[PDB]
Amino acid sequence: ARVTVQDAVEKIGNRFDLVLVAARRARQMQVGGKDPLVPEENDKTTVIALREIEEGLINNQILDVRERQEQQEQEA
């Protein structure tokens, strides 16, 4: 469920980087390359990404770190 984004905006700020990071993460879930980090509540990937942002589990820094480590482990 989702009504307002004030905790996610708080946790990321600028009200515009929140959209971009949430879009990155929602596309990550939408394509079969990632799984939700919070218990799915029948939500769409956009709302799931927002709920992960609110929890603090997703940031622009977390996402790029995970992308980098996935690249590094791709070498294997």
Partner 1 sequence: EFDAIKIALASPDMIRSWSFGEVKKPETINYRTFKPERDGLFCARIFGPVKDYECLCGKYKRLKHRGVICEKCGVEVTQTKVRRERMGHIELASPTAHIWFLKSLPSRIGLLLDMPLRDIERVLYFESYVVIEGGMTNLERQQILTEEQYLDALEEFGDEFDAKMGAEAIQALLKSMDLEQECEQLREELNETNSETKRKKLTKRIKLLEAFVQSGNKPEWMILTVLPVLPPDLRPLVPLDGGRFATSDLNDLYRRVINRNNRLKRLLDLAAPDIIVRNEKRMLQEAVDALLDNGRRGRAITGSNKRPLKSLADMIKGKQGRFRQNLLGKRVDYSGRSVITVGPYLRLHQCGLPKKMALELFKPFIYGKLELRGLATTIKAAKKMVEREEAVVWDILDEVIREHPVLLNRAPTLHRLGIQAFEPVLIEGKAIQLHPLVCAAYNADFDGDQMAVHVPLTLEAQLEARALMMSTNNILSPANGEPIIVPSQDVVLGLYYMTRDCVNAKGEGMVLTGPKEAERLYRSGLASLHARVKVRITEYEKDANGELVAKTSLKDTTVGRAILWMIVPKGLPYSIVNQALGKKAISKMLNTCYRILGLKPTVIFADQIMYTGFAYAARSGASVGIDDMVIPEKKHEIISEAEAEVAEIQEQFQSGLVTAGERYNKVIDIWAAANDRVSKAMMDNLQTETVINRDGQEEKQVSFNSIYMMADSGARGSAAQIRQLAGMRGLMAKPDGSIIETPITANFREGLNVLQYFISTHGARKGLADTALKTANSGYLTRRLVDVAQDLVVTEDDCGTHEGIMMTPVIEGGDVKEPLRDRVLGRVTAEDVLKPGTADILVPRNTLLHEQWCDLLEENSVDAVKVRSVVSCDTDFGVCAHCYGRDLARGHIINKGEAIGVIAAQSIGEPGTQLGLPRVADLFEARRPKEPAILAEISGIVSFGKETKGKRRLVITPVDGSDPYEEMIPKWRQLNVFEGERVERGDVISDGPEAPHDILRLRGVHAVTRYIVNEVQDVYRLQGVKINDKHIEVIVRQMLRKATIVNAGSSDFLEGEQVEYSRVKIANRELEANGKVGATYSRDLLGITKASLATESFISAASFQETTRVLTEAAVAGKRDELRGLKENVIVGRLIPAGTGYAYHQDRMRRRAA
Pick between residue 9 and residue 58 the one whose CB is nearest to partner 1. 9
Cα gap 30→5, rounded to integer Å: 21
Nearest by Cα to 14 from 71, 60, 45, 65: 60
Which stretch, 10-18, 32-40, 61-69, contacts partner 1 (CB under 8 A)? 10-18
Binder of partner 1 out of 11, 43, 59, 66 (CB under 8 A) = 43
Binder of partner 1 out of 11, 27, 34, 66 (CB under 8 A) = 27
Q: Which two tokens stand for residue 73?
A: 């482990």
